């Protein structure tokens, strides 16, 4: 038996996760773009962090991140 109405929403899961939380705000930061530089697009934050590293801009891995 198939449903005549819309009960279940067909979704595609090929994403790591909808959003990445800011190291401070933990806000839903959209993860989009070809670069590996992330920015907390929260109005009032604008904090930048190196995508992989969920923290501040790590100067240690500075260079390996940003683009990848």
- Residue numbers in the known binding site are 22, 25, 40, 45, 50, 53, 61, 65
35 part of the active site: yes
Closest approach of Zn ion to the CB of residue 31, in Å: 14
Q: Examine residue 55 and tell whether it contacts Zn ion (CB under 5 A).
A: no
- Out of 36, 37, 41, 53, the residue judged to bind Zn ion by CB under 5 A: 53
Q: By CB under 5 A, is residue 49 in contact with Zn ion?
A: no
CA atoms within 13 A on the CB side of 34: 0
């Amino acid at each position: 038996g198939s449903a005549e109405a819309r009960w279940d929403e067909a979704s595609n899961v090929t994403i790591k996760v909808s959003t990445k939380p800011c190291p401070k705000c933990r806000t839903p930061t959209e993860r989009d773009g070809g670069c590996m530089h992330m920015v907390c697009t929260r109005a009032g934050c604008g904090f930048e962090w190196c995508w992989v590293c969920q923290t501040e801009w790590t100067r240690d891995c500075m260079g390996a991140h940003w683009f990848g």
